[PDB]
């Protein structure tokens, strides 16, 4: 399930080759997991604690920090891997005609494999990060399901 590509995937905080007294069983083969509290009142989920995925851009198990703006949006498409596009619908005001117009500005955010219970239409919130790609700047902090989907 893991180690797909031409290089080893590891978390460069822990040491995965500690020498035990025996190197047998009963205390070994449970590797430690690196995680941190991202702050701003957000709570880390269990999937980032007991998971086995390896990332370098995950807000929980990764080398990226959260600072700046906190936004929200609705998930539109899940086609490209490990990152999704959300839609922000907002209203614009004109001084001349005292009437509003709705506008949308879709943009790409990053989805770690910690949140894999995501379908089209789920409301997510994002936080500003350093540029992780050409057009990707935001990391998803939590996921909220839409109406229905009771299964």
């Amino acid at each position: 399930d893991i180690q797909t590509e031409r290089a080893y995937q590891k978390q460069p905080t822990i040491f995965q080759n500690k020498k035990r007294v025996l190197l047998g069983e009963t205390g070994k083969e449970k590797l430690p997991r690196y995680y941190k509290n991202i702050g701003l009142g957000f709570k880390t989920p269990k999937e980032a604690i007991e998971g086995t995925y390896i990332d370098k851009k995950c807000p929980f198990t990764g080398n990226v920090s959260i600072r700046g703006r906190i936004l929200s949006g609705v998930v539109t498409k899940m086609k490209m891997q490990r990152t999704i596009v959300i839609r922000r619908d907002y209203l614009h005001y004109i001084r001349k005609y005292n009437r509003f117009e709705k506008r949308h500005k879709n943009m790409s955010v990053h989805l770690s494999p910690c949140f894999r219970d995501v379908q089209i239409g789920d409301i997510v919130t994002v936080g500003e990060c350093r540029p992780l790609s050409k057009t990707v700047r935001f990391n998803v902090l939590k996921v909220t399901k839409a109406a229905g989907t009771k299964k």
């Binding site: 702050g39 701003l40 009142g41 600072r67």
Partner: protein, 262 residues
Amino acid sequence: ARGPKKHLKRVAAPKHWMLDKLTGVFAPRPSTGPHKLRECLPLIIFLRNKLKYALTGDEVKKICMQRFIKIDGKVRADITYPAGFMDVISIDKTGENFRLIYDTKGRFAVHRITPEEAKYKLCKVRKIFVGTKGIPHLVTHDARTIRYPDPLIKMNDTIQIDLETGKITDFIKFDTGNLCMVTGGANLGRIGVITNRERHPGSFDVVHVKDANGNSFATRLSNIFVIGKGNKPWISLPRGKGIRLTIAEERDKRLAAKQSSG
């Protein structure tokens, strides 16, 4: 611009530099120092507009390098030296000292002080650092790196330093019930007591300050200077004690002074 700017236009100057328009094209850009450009005051501006000791830009230079003016116990020979909040300035020969405190409006004010009060200076700690061989460090709001401080000095406290030895004598803790004043913004020079301190994670932590007569206002965390422990101030406050008289009471006071003067 391929490099740093070296000129400064007259109408691009800050308003608290308190200049005129139809005098010259340029304004005195201060040399880099402890204080920022928009929050300091050049020595030429003070000596040529406030104290009226000099009239031109050469007389200020003659007085400045004549070794007559001492800045926080050190003689300075730069005519555009940045002087900011509670910069103790001394004239040794005529025996006068001035303390720079913001008055009831948004500006500086001349304030003659006794020499016994001119020996020390209240200043605000900015951040706490740890040195090379486990030495704690303090960074002060006028960039005074002090080695080995008191263990009870926190991030937003105020320390009192003797100008002859550079060490800490006494301190004020950041807590509600202490006399405070604001340095910057719409509020400036008002003296009040801290009551509330609202914590916002990831942004500016606003506080609430009540005046001694019944007025209240809210400023940011960076716009805080603690000056007293309770009601008694540790320094000599200027005239009016920083009460921020409104325009009606100011008009009434000016009319009363005009009627009494005749």
